[PDB]
Symmetry: C2
């Protein structure tokens, strides 16, 4: 499973360095494999960029699908979205990378097609349930919760998330 | 004029490469000026680093001062915060760079003391007025509004910002 490990390392490098900071030596180091192995699988770095972004895209798409299932099984939307957000914040395994890739896109336009999958998908998921206005406010708050937690070094509790989300989705 | 363009470029390079990733080639590329220029204004990269950190800290103080000023009418809080946020999201030519440096702190610990001036300053402004819960909810929402706007390419409307902020700050 060498190739896959190289692709996932490339995700982590791209999140930290951008598509332009991607190099065989950096990926080799991040995957702890010989540099020559990376050039064998991906001598053309553009092929690695494509593979890495596609891997991230699949993970993003798959995650949103799981959110969809979980939301369909629970009558308390605010509490369910809050628990999902708590898991997302707490995750240290490529949930973290996906989030880092997402924040890297904010000022790296080349990563925005990948990044947009998430807010577009969440809006699509929520709009039929709570309306376009509430779906937008909640997707924005979600972005805030993750960013603010990392910047300030402290997360909102699931209870605090539940309260805020409840406020955003309630009938006016 | 060019000196300031270089200082701002340095802020972006620090955001992308860290406090130690500063180089003349990288700053010149980012400022779109010859390396001749970066070396004239800042022969010592340490001096450039200091100037960028100082600029960012001053900009953050200046912004907080502007918010405090408009919030000192003790009236119409949600709409005042929405208008201020709209001003921020609309002014990419002014804040794009400072926002990048702010966000970079999310995954670069060394940039966090600088970044934290903003939310800490916002909390001090809002906590006595609306309490810790609401003030934190609003600061999280602001971070979300800025990130989501950059990712999706369009900001929440002032109307929608007011509505969501009103929901977050309202009595339980």
């Amino acid at each position: 499973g060498r190739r896959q490990a190289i692709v996932e390392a490339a995700e982590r490098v791209i999140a930290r360095q951008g598509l332009g900071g991607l190099s065989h030596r950096r990926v080799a180091a991040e995957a702890n494999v010989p540099v020559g192995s990376t050039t064998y699988y991906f001598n053309d770095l553009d092929a690695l960029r494509e593979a890495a972004l596609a891997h991230a895209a699949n993970a993003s798409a798959d995650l949103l699908a799981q959110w969809r299932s979980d939301l369909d099984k629970d009558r308390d939307l605010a509490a369910t979205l809050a628990r999902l957000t708590t898991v997302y914040l707490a995750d240290q395994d490529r949930y973290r990378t996906l989030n880092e890739l997402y924040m890297a896109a904010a000022h790296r336009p080349e990563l925005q097609r990948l990044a947009r999958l998430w807010p577009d998908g969440l809006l699509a998921l929520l709009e039929p349930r709570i309306g376009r206005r509430a779906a937008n406010a909640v997707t924005v708050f979600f972005d805030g919760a993750t960013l603010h937690a990392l910047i300030t070094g402290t997360p909102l509790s699931t209870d605090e998330l539940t309260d805020a989300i409840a406020r955003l989705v309630a009938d006016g």
